[PDB]
């Protein structure tokens, strides 16, 4: 086993709630939502610009029943307290002209549209730091070949989108609670 480890050195709990913080202190705060484009409400998943903000507590749920999250496990990521307009907490990835973007949804999605993420251990770190991969279909299965990074839009929103150059790198900090 090489399970996911949180920021304090304890195994990440499956289904538990964590703050998804940048490894580099100066790179902003935790994850939250913004209302962008023609969205009717906040459905865009973004990173807070406030370095002191832990952002929202995020549920990290494996495809398995286990207590912890094994190496190479696909996960679904969801807001413990999502905007009222989202039908569920879960993040999904929606294609667009500029590329896949991380969003919330106004309907309930099938598990195959939310179990699309995987954390990947970053080499050369003392603290457990992970890149976040997006896993598209291998037309029957799934393949995690793209990374999530940030794209600051003309309004300053630091949107989580599929990236090419600089994957974000996070540390998972356990939250006092979710709900």
Q: For the domain that residue 10 is a member of, what is the CATH number?
A: 2.80.10.50
Copy the structure tokens of residue 28.
């902003």
Is 60 in contact with 69 (CB distance < 8 Å)? yes
DSSP state of 114: T
CA angle 167, 168, 171 (to 5 degrees): 140
User: Structural domain tally of the chain?
Assistant: 1
Q: What secondary structure letter does DSSP report for 7?
A: T
Three-class secondary structure of residue 60 per DSSP = strand
The secondary structure of the chain in percent helix, strand, coil, rounded to multiples of 5, reads: 5, 40, 60
Residue among 6, 1, 3, 2 nearest 170 (CA)? 6
Structural domain span for residue 7: 1-179
| Side-chain half-sphere exposure of 40, counting CA atoms within 13 A | 5
Who contacts 71 (Cβ-Cβ below 8 Å, separation ≥6)?
A: 1, 2, 3, 4, 121
């Amino acid at each position: 086993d090489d399970d996911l480890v949180d920021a304090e050195g304890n195994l990440v709990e499956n289904g538990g709630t964590y703050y998804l913080l940048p490894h580099i202190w100066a790179h902003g705060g935790g994850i939250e939502t913004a209302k962008t484009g023609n969205e009717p409400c906040p459905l865009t998943v973004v990173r807070s610009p406030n370095e002191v903000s832990k952002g929202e507590p995020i549920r990290i749920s494996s495809q398995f029943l286990s207590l912890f999250i094994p190496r190479g496990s696909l996960v679904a990521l969801g807001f413990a307290n999502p905007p009222s307009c989202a039908a569920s907490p879960w993040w999904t990835v929606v294609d667009s002209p500029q590329g896949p973007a991380v969003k919330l949804s106004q309907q309930k999605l099938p598990e195959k549209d939310i179990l699309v993420f995987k954390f990947e251990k970053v080499s050369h770190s003392n603290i457990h730091v992970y890149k976040l991969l997006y896993c598209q279909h291998d037309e029957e299965d799934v393949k995690c070949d793209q990374y999530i990074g940030i794209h600051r839009d003309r309004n300053g929103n630091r949107r989580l989108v599929v990236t090419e150059e600089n994957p974000l790198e996070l540390v998972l900090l356990k939250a006092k609670s979710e709900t």
